[PDB]
Amino acid sequence: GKSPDSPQWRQHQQDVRNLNQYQTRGAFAYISDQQKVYARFFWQQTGQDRYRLLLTNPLGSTELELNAQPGNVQLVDNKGQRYTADDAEEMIGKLTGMPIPLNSLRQWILGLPGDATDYKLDDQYRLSEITYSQNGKNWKVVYGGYDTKTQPAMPANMELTDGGQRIKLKMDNWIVK
Template sequence: MYFSQNLSFLHPAKGFLRLLPLSCLMLTACVTTSQNTTKGTGSASDAQWKTHQQELAQLRDYQTRGSFVYNGGETKTYAKFFWQQYTPEKYRLLLTNPLGSRELELTVEPDLARLTTKDGKTHMSDVPSELIYQLTGMEIPLDDLTSWLTGSPGRATEFTLDENHLLKTVMFEQNGEKWQLDYISYDNKTVPMLPNHLELRQGNRIIKLKMDSWTLKK
């Protein structure tokens, strides 16, 4: 498989690259109202948590957009993102530059991932996270991110809940590396309530996602 050189906008020489708002990709506008997570004693056996999980499992077609930060030491990125989920195994991720133009577009289907760069070149693989890493240097656990975006632990079995019976932290291990996912706040205007700020940490790697809006298709 051929991989191109690292995308220039993903490796700024100094600091983060600041981007302008991505108004052109806003399919349905809404203002999020945040509710911060607080330390709680929620149990995975709670009826409220089980009901919330059932509601999340019914989500099939949704979209969210916001800001994306990746700090891996030498690799630092700031971008606007647009995520469109079609089915549990089919989604699209778009990262844009200051003018709102495509810099990276990833489409994932069962057993096939396509990544298109700003020059129009397309690269394919059956492992989306490896495709992102080879082209950008960013290590992102994409296989689980589809669940974590909506506040579900996915395959992780070690997690805590806040006092509102929503996901607070997730601990997991991948390729011998221990990660921690922290939910900072939720959008209390969505039904079910969905995250609007989360952070992933592993060693010196930090991934931050802030969702400006959610669009849910019934």
């Protein structure tokens, strides 16, 4: 698609990084041969390295609560037990069985490649696909329709796959500042 070496893509990156707060919510789905997790999610982010992920059950209870800051991450599991560790990815994988690539997601959920260098844009110069190798772990990110009701537009449909595990995100809306 559209080349990343274009003023439109540079402008989009700038507009997203110029933001200081991001918040979205929607439907979350984690699928693997070991487990299937369906829940409503709430993602709140401040800057590029601080965020909160909340997964709530259909009935209203918390299935997962994760708050992350560089080198400090707190997690409340599906049984309500709270833990603190230094790395978000190791922590979510070890405590819930869902090895979600949170460190990368804090960039990808915003429509930015982050540490990834292998990616492509759609006709509107918006992130469309990403291939990220993380220790033999090739993550494949596919973007669906964007939320064009915000400025800049933000991702509203995302699918992440590792070949085995699959994570689906569908955002109802966003609030950015």
